[PDB]
Amino acid sequence: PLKVEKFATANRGNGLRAVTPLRPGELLFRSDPLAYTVCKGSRGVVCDRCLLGKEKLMRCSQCRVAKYCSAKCQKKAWPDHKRECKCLKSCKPRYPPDSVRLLGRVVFKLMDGAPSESEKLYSFYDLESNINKLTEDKKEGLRQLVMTFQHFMREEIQDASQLPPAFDLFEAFAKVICNSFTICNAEMQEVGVGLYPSISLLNHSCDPNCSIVFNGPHLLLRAVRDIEVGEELTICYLDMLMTSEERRKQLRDQYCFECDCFRCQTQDKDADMLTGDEQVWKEVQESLKKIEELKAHWKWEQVLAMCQAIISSNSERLPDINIYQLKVLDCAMDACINLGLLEEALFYGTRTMEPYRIFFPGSHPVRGVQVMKVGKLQLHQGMFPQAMKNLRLAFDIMRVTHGREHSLIEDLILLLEECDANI
Numbered sequence: 001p002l003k004v005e006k007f008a009t010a011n012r013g014n015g016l017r018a019v020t021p022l023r024p025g026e027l028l029f030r031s032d033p034l035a036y037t038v039c040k041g042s043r044g045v046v047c048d049r050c051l052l053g054k055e056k057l058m059r060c061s062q063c064r065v066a067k068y069c070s071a072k073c074q075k076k077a078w079p080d081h082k083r084e085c086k087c088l089k090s091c092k093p094r095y096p097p098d099s100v101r102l103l104g105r106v107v108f109k110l111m112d113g114a115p116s117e118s119e120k121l122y123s124f125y126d127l128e129s130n131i132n133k134l135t136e137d138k139k140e141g142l143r144q145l146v147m148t149f150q151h152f153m154r155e156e157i158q159d160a161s162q163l164p165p166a167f168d169l170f171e172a173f174a175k176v177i178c179n180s181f182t183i184c185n186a187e188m189q190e191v192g193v194g195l196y197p198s199i200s201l202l203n204h205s206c207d208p209n210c211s212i213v214f215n216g217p218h219l220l221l222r223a224v225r226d227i228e229v230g231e232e233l234t235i236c237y238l239d240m241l242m243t244s245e246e247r248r249k250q251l252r253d254q255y256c257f258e259c260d261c262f263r264c265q266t267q268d269k270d271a272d273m274l275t276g277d278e279q280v281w282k283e284v285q286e287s288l289k290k291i292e293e294l295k296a297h298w299k300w301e302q303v304l305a306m307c308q309a310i311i312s313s314n315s316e317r318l319p320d321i322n323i324y325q326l327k328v329l330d331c332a333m334d335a336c337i338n339l340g341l342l343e344e345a346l347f348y349g350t351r352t353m354e355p356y357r358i359f360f361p362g363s364h365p366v367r368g369v370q371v372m373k374v375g376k377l378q379l380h381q382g383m384f385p386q387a388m389k390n391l392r393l394a395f396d397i398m399r400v401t402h403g404r405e406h407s408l409i410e411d412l413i414l415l416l417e418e419c420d421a422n423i
């Protein structure tokens with residue numbers, strides 16, 4: 001019994017809107033991907049199927065590229081892995097761009113698979129391609145991806161008959177660039193990339209009324225505000241820790257539109273995001289490219305060493321409300337968590353709390369997770385008043401953003417029961 005419907009918007013293509021009134025935290029839609037895969041940096045670190053980290057993964061012996069937490073996941077992934085296996089084998093030791101592997105899985109799913117539930121409201125066929133808006137160098141990039149695909153698929157796909165009817169590879173890559181979801185794990189690390197075509201109906205806002213959250217590859221779409229019958233549903237395509245200029249560029253480059261929202265009109269919060277010595281935060285911005293690369297490959301010790309040279313720099317420092325400092329602090333926290341340095345993690349974690357309160361207003365899944373992490377760190381150092389405060393806060397946010405259908409909630413519920421014992 002669906003609470004949402006596709007409709008044609010006035011000036012931003014198709015969209016999704018409420019059929020009934022919606023309360024904050026209400027579950028609107030849930031979906032497995034049409035197709036999905038591990039990100040290049042998380043390959044060999046998380047299970048290809050369920051996208052969880054394990055220190056020891058089993059590999060597919062044919063290709064030795066697909067790896068798995070367990071026999072269960074490896075056997076169940078086989079149907080959707082079969083045909084890419086060969087392609088991946090012959091490609092070695094060089095690995096295709098994530099978008100190519102993803103499209104491969106799309107083409108196999110469409111050709112070999114039953115009709116997907118992910119396409120109930122909107123199919124891959126319907127996805128926006130923005131073809132008449134692409135720049136020539138973006139076009140050039142798509143043509144390279146098309147030829148990369150043909151090379152990668154030379155064995156499994158020789159001609160048009162093995163693609164769907166009237167399938168155009170250029171058009172399909174155009175779809176993939178602006179309809180690919182970055183799948184994040186429970187701790188909000190980017191772990192994979194997928195297509196969820198029904199979810200791709202939702203248009204963008206820098207102040208959205210809905211939210212999406214991932215439980216492995218399974219995506220949950222929830223309302224994070226009150227929403228009236230006939231009102232457009234929106235999610236934020238972007239990281240909240242971006243300036244309007246940074247949002248402008250990515251929404252142009254990747255999604256081919258100009259955002260007309262209040263926040264973009266007023267440069268909302270931009271000034272506060274860029275406080276401190278300009279010179280210092282440009283070096284830190286520079287350095288974050290390297291830091292974020294190390295983090296995507298889970299190289300925690302190096303992430304932390306780089307972060308500590310900024311946070312505890314002998315030279316001039318930034319305020320924690322500065323978004324580049326903030327990012328550096330979050331990376332540091334997470335590095336310390338995974339290296340088992342729980343004291344240092346907590347120092348950093350606590351310092352992110354006020355800026356997150358400001359930058360993730362209402363109910364945002366990323367703040368809820370950050371608060372849980374800080375609450376969790378406190379709990380396991382004996383700070384039971386403070387910990388209980390944050391865990392209840394995390395629950396207040398995540399009951400809206402995650403909901404009882406997400407298993408991280410059950411983990412928090414147990415943490416709440418536990419911390420409740422002391423009092």
Ligand SMILES: O=C1Cc2cc(C(=O)N[C@H]3C[C@H]4CC[C@@H](C3)N4S(=O)(=O)N3CCC(NCc4ccccc4)CC3)c(Cl)cc2N1
Nearest residue numbers: 178179180181182184188200236237238239240327330331
């Ligand atoms: O048709 C489509 C295709 C598509 C893609 C996306 C999408 O993938 N968005 C990204 C993933 C998530 C959700 C929004 C934003 C960008 N992120 S995030 O920022 O919430 N996310 C990824 C980055 C993480 N880390 C932030 C960080 C970076 C660097 C240092 C410290 C922290 C936190 C979780 C979204 Cl939201 C909608 C959508 N509709």
Ligand SMILES: C[S@@+](CC[C@H](N)C(=O)[O-])C[C@H]1O[C@@H](n2cnc3c(N)ncnc32)[C@H](O)[C@@H]1O
Nearest residue numbers: 012013014128178200201202203204255256257
């Ligand atoms: C994932 S889709 C959203 C659904 C899309 N509108 C459609 O018709 O299929 C992304 C595309 O929708 C359009 N879009 C999304 N949010 C928008 C906004 N706030 N303003 C204008 N266009 C937007 C852009 O063309 C963008 O590339």
Ligand SMILES: [Zn+2]
Nearest residue numbers: 047050069073
């Ligand atoms: Zn698994």
Ligand SMILES: [Zn+2]
Nearest residue numbers: 060062063085
């Ligand atoms: Zn294989």
Ligand SMILES: [Zn+2]
Nearest residue numbers: 206259261264
């Ligand atoms: Zn905007």
